[PDB]
Design a protein around this ligand. Structure first.
Ligand SMILES: O=C(O)c1c[nH]c2c(Br)cccc2c1=O
Length: 438
């Protein structure tokens, strides 16, 4: 397989569903390289747990935690890290209201080279225990010889784009990592970076981030096919923002319009949204506590009941993960019979204006509140016209893409309700015998 897309290990499924999965201990293992220094970009951190995931011989190597916490949350994080002399912190600036630092990324500097990991898990025990999470593993990037002048750039522009993303933080600790990346050869990378950074982007910068970045990539590096209007759009996420009073406000006006783009030329495209139902959560491996990581509030949901008619249950027999609640977020473009896909994106971005951006100032400015990061798999980057969908995620011409959940997606039944985390569920107990009383 050339894609290097993995799921995290799930405690409680049979070994056959964990064979090709990765735990954080595997990612940080000496088998992957001899660690010199690392940066951990994330949202939530359990520092005691995190240090224990590094191999004993690597636990005093420098670690940088890149986070978005302010005030008391910021002090708690500093207090967590203070016992560890080798840990530095970098507070990502969040100058727009209600923004968050959601990007999940590891920069791993070895003696042998550099690795980049873009993933979907927080750095806490429960995110790696019984959830469905995604990981993209870069190749080992070798150092460019001192005195040798080459770009080290890939056909997907990954090196320039990763540096651009880091430069947006305007942070001294990340300028060091930028200089590290400059010195390595990233030319083997076959994925495109899609990031969000907070700001108001106009003119040349409008295409740099969020759903306009996605649109630009699909315009330039994907091809439109006959009957493209029949190829659905699938979005799969663990949280929903306030999208407005009807679908025309954002979801189907600008978001879907970016996601529908294919090729350079100029809607009834079906849109499937996958989001766990209450029953999905109740019968999950974790039980109702899995809903602690699906933070859809009743306040938001009651303003957009129109949205729930797009919702499809979580189902993942293909990877043995129907009862491992999703914290991965994915977006893709399958064929009408779901046997191939025009592209696939794995990201930290949920279905929200905060993450993807919303147009302002008469359509001339893209406003983004949050930091997010994902990678886009395009067939053209692999010498292909489309990807065949892998029938079983862990089974087996290794040019078929491992989609981690079942297709086609199954619509909510009439008795189903979207998981809403701040209301009680006292009708039926979960897999541990408990109810949900927020
Ligand atoms: O980006 C992330 O990983 C997350 C961000 N916010 C969350 C909230 Br608010 C409540 C529960 C879980 C998460 C979460 O997982």
């Amino acid at each position: 397989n050339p894609f290097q897309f993995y799921l995290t290990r799930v405690s409680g499924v049979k070994p056959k569903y964990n064979s090709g999965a990765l735990h954080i201990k595997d990612i940080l293992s000496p088998l992957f390289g001899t660690l010199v220094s690392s940066a951990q970009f994330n949202y939530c951190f359990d520092v005691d747990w995190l240090v224990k995931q590094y191999p004993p011989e690597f636990r005093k190597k420098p670690i940088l935690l890149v986070h978005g916490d302010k005030r008391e949350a910021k002090a708690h994080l500093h207090a967590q890290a203070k016992p560890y002399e080798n840990i530095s912190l970098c507070q990502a600036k969040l100058d727009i209201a209600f923004g968050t630092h959601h990007t999940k990324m590891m920069l791993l500097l070895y003696e042998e080279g550099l690795r980049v990991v873009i993933h979907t898990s927080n750095l806490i025990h429960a995110d790696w225990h019984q959830k469905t999470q995604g990981i993209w593993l870069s190749p080992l990037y070798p150092r460019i010889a001192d005195g040798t002048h080459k770009s080290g750039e890939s056909p997907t522009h990954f090196k320039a784009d990763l540096i651009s993303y880091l430069m947006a933080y305007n942070a001294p600790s990340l300028k060091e990592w930028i200089d590290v990346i400059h010195k390595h050869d990233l030319s083997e990378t076959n994925v495109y970076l899609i990031g969000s950074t907070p700001g108001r982007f106009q003119g040349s910068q409008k295409d740099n981030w969020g759903h306009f970045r996605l649109k630009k990539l699909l315009k330039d590096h994907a091809s439109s096919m006959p009957n493209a209007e029949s190829w659905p759009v699938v979005g799969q996420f663990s949280s929903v923002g306030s999208l407005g009073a009807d679908e025309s406000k954002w979801l189907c006006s600008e978001f879907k319009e970016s996601m529908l783009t294919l090729g350079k030329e100029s809607s009834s495209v079906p849109l499937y949204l996958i989001y766990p139902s209450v029953e999905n959560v109740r019968t999950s491996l974790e039980g109702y506590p899995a809903g602690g990581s699906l933070p859809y509030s009743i306040q938001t949901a009651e303003k957009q009941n129109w949205l729930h008619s797009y919702f499809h249950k979580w189902s993942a027999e293909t990877s043995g993960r129907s009862n491992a609640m999703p914290h991965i977020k994915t977006y893709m473009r399958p064929s009408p019979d779901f046997s191939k896909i025009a592209w696939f994106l794995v990201t930290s971005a949920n279905l929200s204006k905060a993450a993807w951006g919303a147009l302002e100032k008469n359509g001339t400015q893209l406003m983004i509140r949050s930091y997010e990061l994902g990678v886009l798999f395009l067939p053209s980057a692999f010498g292909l016209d489309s990807f065949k969908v892998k029938q079983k995620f862990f089974a087996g011409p290794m040019a078929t893409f491992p989609v981690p959940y079942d297709l086609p997606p199954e619509l909510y039944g009439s008795k189903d309700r979207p998981w809403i985390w701040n209301i009680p569920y006292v009708k039926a107990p979960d897999t541990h015998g408990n109810m949900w009383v927020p």
